[PDB]
Amino acid sequence: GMSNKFLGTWKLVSSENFDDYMKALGVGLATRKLGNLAKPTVIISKKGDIITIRTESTFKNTEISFKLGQEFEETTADNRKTKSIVTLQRGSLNQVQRWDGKETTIKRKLVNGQMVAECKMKGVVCTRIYEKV
C-alpha cells in the first residue's frame, strides 16, 4: 500500500507554474493572487485503510479521506465539487478529480525525502515541493 514515508506533516517550500494551473482550473484573479501567496501545510495520516490528506492555509483548508481505488466526493480548495479517485502507481499517490466533463490530476511522490506534487490540467503542469516538518 501507500508507503508510511508519506505519513506526517509537510510544508510547501517551492511552487512552479501554479498560477497557470489555477487559470486552467477556472480560478479567478483575486483568488489566484491569494493562492500564489499561500504556503500550505499538508498532513497525511491513515487509520486502517482510510488515508486522509489535510491541507491547511490561512486562505483555505481542505480535507479528503479515501480508500485507494474507490471513488469519493471531494470539495476542492477553489470550491469545485468533484468525483475523485486516488490510486498507487510505482509508489506514487495519484489523485484524479472529475467534474463537469473535465479532469485534473495531482500526483504525489517522494524524492530524496521531499514530497513532490505534480498538478496537471489540460497540458498545463505545476510542480510543488514539500519538506517534511
Next chain:
Amino acid sequence: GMSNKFLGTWKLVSSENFDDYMKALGVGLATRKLGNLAKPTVIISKKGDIITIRTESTFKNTEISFKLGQEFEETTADNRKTKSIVTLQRGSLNQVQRWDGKETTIKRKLVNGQMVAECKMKGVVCTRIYEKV
C-alpha cells in the same frame, strides 16, 4: 468496497463487437477466430482485500489478483504484459490496462443480476453479458 454480489461464477451468454475489440488490441486472425468462439466462465472471489478474477476457456485461462487502486502486473489472454489498475466507480469495477503507450479499459457492472462487461480500446466498444451460475 466491491459489492459481494460480484462474488461467484459467471458464464458468458452474449458478446457484441468482440472481434473489432480484439482487432484494436492487435490480436491476429486465427486467434480472433478462437476468441470469437470461446464462451468463458469468469470466477470472482476475494480473500481479505485481495480480489481475484479468473477467466476459464478451452483456449486460454487467465487470472489476476489485486487490491483496489494499486497497480499490478498482468498477463492478458492474448499475452500482453500490462500494468493494470482496478478501481470502483458507482459500484462498477473498472480495469485499466496499460502497455506500450496504449490503454484499454474493461468495466464490469451488475445489471438486473447479470454482469455486464464493457471493453473499450481506441473508441471501439465491446459488450459481454454474463449470467451467474
